[PDB]
């Protein structure tokens, strides 16, 4: 009853493939994109989908645009399989997989130099499908699966075959949904990523903490800090490399103990930046003469 | 440089009633790249600090 839309959301970028990359008739399927609302991680429809149980597309017309010149040529056929379990991948003939496409109602073929659309065929009854990740049966959570089949070798302007896998366009969705039963859906549909890696500073005074201010990060978002160092001869001089990193705001202690009797490379710092995309932490070394660099990785959730 | 910026400092406030920005290319159909064009309404949302 929570009807939202109509809006626009970018599904994926479609990558047309060369003639040598096509071997079996199953290899003509460029994209096999499930059109569940919880299947486009990072977009606006998927972020909303994790806050209701059920949904139903009232109008899901998928709008393809080219990203390619008009001087190269190839031909696509594109449809939405309403059954999420009818799999065209086990068809051993190359023409039968594209007759499988145009036979589905609501299908469309086009040159890939122009912008065409494929609408989603509504059911005859009133069935809602579930959001979230696909647990056991696909027929509960997927309303359709978008396919794009390459039917033509990718030629160029110069009369030659393209030898490289070429990104050839983009897929956008013009969507209009219902929803029901507001909730949270326990599996998070986000993905984490090592944002950047930057080394610890080299303090001058042994056993005195000088504060390292790092910049360049996004404002007012929470980060995670784990140490990582590569090819450092800590025994090139006397002393033991003992580091202790604490935030002045967050929580956690990164400890680097390169004593070869008891080794402790452990700990993690949870800290969030200020309004200016900066944060600071107390870096201290027991033996300041040991100038071997040690880094850390900034973990962040991107979507 | 436009007259609208010249005339804007002779009133206190404004409001865009209709504002449609119309991209004109100057390039043939032989080179290809895909753009996406929008007008964000918050002037402090900045995409320039996104790592993806």
């Amino acid at each position: 009853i929570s009807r939202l839309g109509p809006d626009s959301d970018f599904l994926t970028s479609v990558v047309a493939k060369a003639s040598t990359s096509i071997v079996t008739p199953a290899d003509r399927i460029l994209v096999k994109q499930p059109l569940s609302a919880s299947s486009f991680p990072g977009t606006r429809i998927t972020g909303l989908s994790s806050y209701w149980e059920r949904y139903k597309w009232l109008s899901a017309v998928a709008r393809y645009v080219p990203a390619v010149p008009n001087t190269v040529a190839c031909q696509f056929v594109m449809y939405i399989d309403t059954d999420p379990l009818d799999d065209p991948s086990n068809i051993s003939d190359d023409n039968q997989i594209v007759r499988q496409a145009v036979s589905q109602a609501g299908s469309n073929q086009f040159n890939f130099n122009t912008s065409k659309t494929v609408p989603l065929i509504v059911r005859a009854d009133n069935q809602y499908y579930y959001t979230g990740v696909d647990k056991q049966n696909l027929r509960f959570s997927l309303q359709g699966i978008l396919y794009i089949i390459q039917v033509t070798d990718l030629i160029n302007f110069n009369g030659e075959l393209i030898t490289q896998d070429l990104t050839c366009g983009s897929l956008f969705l013009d969507w209009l949904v219902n929803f029901s039963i507001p909730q949270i859906n326990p599996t998070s549909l986000t993905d984490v990523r090592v944002d950047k890696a930057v080394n610890f500073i080299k303090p001058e005074v042994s056993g005195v903490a000088e504060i390292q201010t790092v910049t360049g990060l996004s404002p007012s978002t929470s980060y995670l800090l784990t140490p990582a160092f590569l090819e450092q001869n800590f025994q090139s001089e006397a002393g033991i490399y003992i580091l202790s990193a604490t935030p002045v705001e967050g929580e956690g202690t990164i400890s680097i103990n390169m004593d070869p009797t008891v080794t402790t490379v452990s700990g993690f710092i949870k800290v969030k930046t200020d309004t200016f995309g900066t944060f600071d932490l107390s870096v201290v070394l027991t033996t300041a003469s040991k100038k071997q660099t040690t880094g850390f990785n900034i973990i962040a959730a991107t979507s | 440089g436009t007259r609208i910026t010249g005339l804007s400092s002779y009133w206190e406030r404004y409001k865009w009633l209709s504002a449609v920005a119309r991209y004109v290319p100057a390039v043939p159909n032989t080179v290809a790249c895909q753009f996406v064009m929008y007008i964000d309404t918050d002037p402090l949302d900045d995409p320039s600090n996104i790592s993806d």
Partner: peptide
Amino acid sequence: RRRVVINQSNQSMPVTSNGAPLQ
């Protein structure tokens, strides 16, 4: 006898034409 039933188990496919200029 013979009877000619207009079978209604098909679907259309209308063809549209276009074409891009040089500029």
